Amino acid sequence: PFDNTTYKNLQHHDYSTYTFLDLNLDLSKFRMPQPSSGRESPRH
């Protein structure tokens, strides 16, 4: 049934204030190990 008449992006009605940051916390395990400059900060 090819539907072309309804807006399929109804998910963002259900987003809260921490949606982006909870998705970052969820994605924190899938990601590669970060590179290092060799120092803790440019003021170290």
Partner: protein
């Protein structure tokens, strides 16, 4: 830096005292304003030797050539990153 292009000759500063009437700066040194301009150091040395003045010479202090790089403000791993710009 256009005031650092020539050699100058001045003299040791003598006594300036307070005028009792007005508080003005009274002097007795005739050479207190005598500033002379010379193109090189040797012209100044020759002029002071010709006039019998005991002199001392300070050599010219140039600023040494710095190493500048705008990209060094944003290094990957050096301390020379700017924290703000």
């Amino acid at each position: 830096v256009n005031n650092t292009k020539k050699w100058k000759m001045e003299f040791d500063t003598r006594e300036r005292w307070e005028n009792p009437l007005m508080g003005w700066a009274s002097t007795a040194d005739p050479l207190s304003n005598l500033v002379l301009t010379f193109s090189t150091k040797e012209d100044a040395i020759a002029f002071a030797e010709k006039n019998g003045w005991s002199y001392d010479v300070e050599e010219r202090k140039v600023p040494k050539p710095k190493s500048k790089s705008y990209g060094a403000n944003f290094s990957w791993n050096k301390r020379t990153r700017v924290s703000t710009k």
